[PDB]
Every structure is written in structure tokens, then in C-alpha cells.
RNA sequence: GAACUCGCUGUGAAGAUGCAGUGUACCCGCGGCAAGACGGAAAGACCCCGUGAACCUUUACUAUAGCUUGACACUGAACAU
């Protein structure tokens, strides 16, 4: 899955970029706590 | 099935009231007995057959519920080997 980040998650990514992350990771953690949004543009 | 429904000996799907020979016997009831009518009942239960049935068994065949194994999915993160 592709996510547009909204924060600096000290694991892997910085703000405002599209990054390939596990679908479950994005669905359960990133999206539900801000941090990221899906890459729909 | 219909009967004007005797005994014997034989013959005969091979154990005869009914065929042959022969003996006996007037016609008809009533009370009894139960030897025969292969008496009545039940399309033999025993036996065999049917490429018949049913239930039952098992290390008969084929499956399958269940139990169980792993892959993939729901399912992600960090790190160390
Ligand atoms: Mg005789
Ligand atoms: Mg006689
Ligand atoms: Mg009498
Ligand atoms: Mg009798
Ligand atoms: Mg009597
Ligand atoms: Mg009889
Ligand atoms: Mg019969």
C-alpha cells in the first residue's frame, strides 16, 4: 500500500511523502492515528 | 370347481370316493369319535435361486463429517541471530 505521511514516524518516513508500507500497518496504525493518508491524490 | 361323495387289490404325476377288476351296500336323520378327505388357516419361516432388499461388521472398494498438518488471507512494528 502507498501512504502519504503526515508526521515524522521515527521508524521509516518523514512528512509529506508517498511511501510503500504494509497494508495492515497502514490500515490499523498510520491512518487511524493521523500520521498518514492513502495515496489517492 | 361340480357331485347321484363305499371297501380292497392293482394302475396311475410314482400314497385313489371317482381309473381297472372285484366284494359289499334299501332311502334319510340324531348323539358321539377323529383314521382319511395329501382336511381349514398362513403365495414355506427350513433349503436353493434373484447379477433382490434391508440393517450389522471389518485391516473389502470408494467417498465423507470430525480431528489434525502446512501455505496464503484477516496480519502489524522494532531488534538480534
Ligand atoms: Mg391305492
Ligand atoms: Mg381305498
Ligand atoms: Mg353325524
Ligand atoms: Mg379325521
Ligand atoms: Mg372333537
Ligand atoms: Mg392343509
Ligand atoms: Mg411361495
Swiss-Prot record:
Q: Which gene encodes it?
A: rplI
Report the function annotation for this chain: Binds to the 23S rRNA.
Family (UniProt): Belongs to the bacterial ribosomal protein bL9 family.
* Organism the protein comes from: Shigella dysenteriae serotype 1 (strain Sd197)
Cleavable signal peptide: none
Where the shown chain sits in the full protein?
1 to 41 of 149
Q: Which domain of life is it from?
A: Bacteria
Q: Would you tell me the protein name for this molecule?
A: Large ribosomal subunit protein bL9
Amino acid at each position: 500500500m502507498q501512504v502519504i505521511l503526515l508526521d515524522k514516524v521515527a521508524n521509516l518516513g518523514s512528512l509529506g511523502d508517498q511511501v510503500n508500507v504494509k497494508a495492515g500497518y497502514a490500515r490499523n496504525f498510520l491512518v487511524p492515528q493521523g500520521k498518514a493518508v492513502p495515496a489517492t491524490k
